[PDB]
Amino acid sequence: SARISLFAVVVEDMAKSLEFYRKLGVEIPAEADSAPHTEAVLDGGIRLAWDTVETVRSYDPEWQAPTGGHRFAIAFEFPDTASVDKKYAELVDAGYEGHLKPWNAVWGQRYAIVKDPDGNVVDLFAPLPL
Template sequence: MTPQLDAIGIVTSDMAASLAFYRRLGIDIPADADAQPHVEATLPNGLRLLWDTEETLRSFDAGWQPPQPGAGRLGLAFLCASPREVDEVYEALVGAGYEGHLKPWDAVWGQRYATVHDPDGGEVSLFAPSAA
C-alpha cells in the first residue's frame, strides 16, 4: 500500500480561538467542539483537519515544545472563488483582529495571493487565479 495524505494536524494553545479562525474560512466545526482537547473536521474533498491542545500533545509526548514564533514550517492554503474574494476574506480576517502577514497582491505566478496568521502563528494563504 502507498501511504496517502489523510489529515493535517494543528496544535493549538487556545482551541476555541483556533476553531473560530477556521470557521471564518468556511470549515464546518460544531460549536460544542470549542472545549474539546481533540477536534476533527472532514473537508468536502475527504481530507481531515485535526486540532489538538498543547496539553493533549504533551499527554503522549512529554517533551513536546511549541515552535518559536515565526519558525513555522507548514502552511495551509485556501482557494478563493476570485481575486476579489481573496481581498474580502483577508480584510474580514484582519478586521476581526487576526494578524495580516502579506496583504493581497498579484503574484507573478498568476494568482491573487495574501497571507494571514492563525491564532497560533500558523501561516494561512488565501489565493485565486488572477483575473484574465
C-alpha cells in the first residue's frame, strides 16, 4: 500500500515562511529563500515541503488563499515547559500571530499555539511533569 511521503504547505512568500520555520529548528539552507519549492527531510524520511502560490497555480490556476480556521496543524515538541514559553514569546515578538498563549493544557502538556505566515496552525508543547 501507499506510504505518507510529504506534508506540503502553500506559501505566498517562501522567504517569510522559511524564516518562521527556521525559528522552530527546521534545517533549511539560506538559498532556499529564493526557491519556488523547498523541502526538509524529517524523522523516518518523511518530508515537510513548501511551494509558492504561483507554483501551486501551475496545476490549480484558480487557487486563492483561504480565510478562517485551520484544517492542518504541525506540532513541535520541546524538552521542557520553560522552552515552550520562551519560544512562544520569541515568535510573538517577531510579529507572528499568537493564537493561544502558553497554558497548562488539561490533557497534560504545557501548550501554546501560533499561526505561521500563511495561516497554518503550529502547536508548541512539552509534557507536564508528573
